Design an enzyme around this catalytic site. Structure first.
Site, mmCIF file in Angstrom:
data_model
loop_
_atom_site.group_PDB
_atom_site.id
_atom_site.type_symbol
_atom_site.label_atom_id
_atom_site.label_comp_id
_atom_site.label_asym_id
_atom_site.label_seq_id
_atom_site.Cartn_x
_atom_site.Cartn_y
_atom_site.Cartn_z
ATOM 1 N N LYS A 38 31.731 83.220 144.840
ATOM 2 C CA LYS A 38 30.350 83.519 144.597
ATOM 3 C C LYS A 38 29.873 83.567 146.128
ATOM 4 O O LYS A 38 30.652 82.988 146.974
ATOM 5 C CB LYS A 38 29.256 82.634 143.954
ATOM 6 C CG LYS A 38 29.328 81.322 144.247
ATOM 7 C CD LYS A 38 28.414 80.558 143.441
ATOM 8 C CE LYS A 38 28.543 78.803 143.965
ATOM 9 N NZ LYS A 38 27.495 78.182 143.123
ATOM 10 N N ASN B 76 29.844 80.525 148.340
ATOM 11 C CA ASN B 76 31.029 79.609 148.774
ATOM 12 C C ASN B 76 31.949 80.905 149.882
ATOM 13 O O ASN B 76 33.048 80.429 149.799
ATOM 14 C CB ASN B 76 31.884 79.607 147.533
ATOM 15 C CG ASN B 76 31.448 78.495 146.696
ATOM 16 O OD1 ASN B 76 30.509 77.537 147.410
ATOM 17 N ND2 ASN B 76 31.710 78.127 145.389
ATOM 18 N N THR C 216 29.188 78.946 137.895
ATOM 19 C CA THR C 216 27.780 79.245 138.113
ATOM 20 C C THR C 216 27.760 80.415 136.950
ATOM 21 O O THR C 216 28.544 81.374 137.268
ATOM 22 C CB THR C 216 27.474 79.643 139.405
ATOM 23 O OG1 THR C 216 27.463 78.549 140.294
ATOM 24 C CG2 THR C 216 26.183 80.267 139.459
HETATM 25 C C1 LIG Z 1 30.217 74.787 157.156
HETATM 26 C C2 LIG Z 1 29.836 74.639 156.051
HETATM 27 C C3 LIG Z 1 31.010 74.000 155.032
HETATM 28 C C4 LIG Z 1 30.522 73.911 153.700
HETATM 29 C C5 LIG Z 1 31.449 73.009 152.954
HETATM 30 N N1 LIG Z 1 31.264 73.000 151.771
HETATM 31 N N2 LIG Z 1 30.208 73.370 150.938
HETATM 32 C C6 LIG Z 1 29.608 74.327 151.598
HETATM 33 N N3 LIG Z 1 28.564 74.966 150.915
HETATM 34 C C7 LIG Z 1 27.667 76.276 151.256
HETATM 35 C C8 LIG Z 1 26.478 76.431 150.705
HETATM 36 N N4 LIG Z 1 26.740 75.889 149.103
HETATM 37 C C9 LIG Z 1 25.412 76.327 148.562
HETATM 38 C C10 LIG Z 1 25.846 76.167 147.070
HETATM 39 C C11 LIG Z 1 24.701 76.269 145.996
HETATM 40 N N5 LIG Z 1 23.544 76.612 146.583
HETATM 41 C C12 LIG Z 1 23.199 76.647 147.995
HETATM 42 C C13 LIG Z 1 24.381 76.491 148.893
HETATM 43 C C14 LIG Z 1 28.126 75.980 148.830
HETATM 44 C C15 LIG Z 1 28.916 74.914 149.435
HETATM 45 C C16 LIG Z 1 29.660 74.589 152.895
HETATM 46 C C17 LIG Z 1 32.300 74.079 155.501
HETATM 47 C C18 LIG Z 1 32.532 74.457 156.894
HETATM 48 N N6 LIG Z 1 31.468 74.825 157.743
#
Ligand code: A1BVM
Length: 280
Positions: free
Chosen positions: A140, A143, A179
């Site tokens: 999605k 991600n 999701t």
């Molecule tokens: C920067 C960041 C990251 C990183 C690692 N793991 N998960 C991350 N997030 C990103 C945002 N996210 C959501 C999901 C649902 N609603 C809002 C936001 C999904 C998961 C970012 C790795 C390396 N540099």
């Protein structure tokens, strides 16, 4: 498998918290010995065996094992793993240009050329994963992260392998649900799952990139899930009247209920448009 149990603060200094999901915390960090910058993802451990909060050890170990196997420009690199009583801490490659979700929110919709520039990279990363028999199961826009959001053709990396599984018997049949807006009908229906589920999610992503609208989204999670199961979507003229027929063909061949009739990752790369949790 056990991980490094020295205090991570002895080796890294943390900074800004980055955007993440409800369950993990992600912080920018800097390794003391090299000055190199990383993202530290803190995964909360389960406090008891029969607990619902936190991530089970089996699930953490699966995510770490998959991260350790993968090395490709369009997937995030794992640097090190630490652990303490409360958390497993993944030291990941830093991707600093933000989420594709937030990039799309700024542009509203992408042109077909802009969409295909992103899609080619997503498809290349998924081709690598599927070649290793790894299903991501949570593709999605949130991600997918941009290396730098200020260039004309931003480069991307797929993150967060928390649902990913090795599929060595063709399918998995267990507790796997992503999701609602992005899951395939076989997820909604609790059927055996394989690499085909990721291809459906790519169809959803492509629809969103071109229109700014989500194809199955209802007013509640149950409505979205019922819409997915019924393949209840259409190419609304207000969004798609000027979109090429080939782009619609691409999406149409991914948003197919029967997983066996859906385009595979190899098919998607040869397609003429391209070729050069669940409960409220
Ligand atoms: C920067 C960041 C990251 C990183 C690692 N793991 N998960 C991350 N997030 C990103 C945002 N996210 C959501 C999901 C649902 N609603 C809002 C936001 C999904 C998961 C970012 C790795 C390396 N540099």
């Amino acid at each position: 498998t056990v991980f490094r149990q020295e205090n991570v603060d002895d080796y890294y200094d943390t900074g800004e918290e980055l955007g993440s999901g409800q369950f993990a915390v992600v912080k920018k960090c800097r390794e003391k010995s090299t000055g190199l910058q990383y993202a530290a993802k803190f995964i909360k451990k389960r406090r008891t065996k029969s607990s619902r909060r936190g991530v089970s050890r089996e699930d953490i170990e699966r995510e770490v094992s998959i991260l350790k196997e993968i090395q490709h420009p369009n997937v995030i690199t794992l640097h090190e793993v630490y652990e303490n009583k409360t958390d497993v801490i993944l030291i990941l490659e830093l991707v600093a240009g933000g989420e594709l979700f937030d990039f799309l929110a700024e542009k509203e919709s992408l042109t077909e050329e802009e969409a295909t520039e992103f899609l080619k990279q997503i498809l290349n990363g998924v081709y690598y994963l599927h070649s290793l028999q790894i299903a991501h199961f949570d593709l999605k826009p949130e991600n997918i992260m941009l290396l730098d959001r200020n260039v004309p053709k931003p480069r991307i990396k797929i993150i967060d392998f928390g649902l990913a599984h090795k599929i060595d018997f063709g399918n998995e049949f267990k507790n796997i649900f992503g999701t609602p807006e992005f899951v395939a009908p076989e997820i909604v229906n609790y059927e055996p799952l394989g690499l085909e589920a990721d291809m459906w999610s790519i169809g959803v992503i492509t629809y969103i990139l071109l229109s700014g609208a989500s194809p199955f989204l209802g007013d509640t999670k149950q409505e979205t899930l019922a819409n997915v199961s019924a393949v209840n979507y259409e190419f609304e003229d207000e969004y798609f009247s000027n979109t090429s027929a080939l782009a619609k063909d691409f999406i149409r061949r991914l948003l197919v209920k029967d997983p066996k009739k859906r385009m595979t990752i190899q098919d998607s790369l040869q397609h003429p448009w391209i070729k050069p949790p669940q409960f409220e």
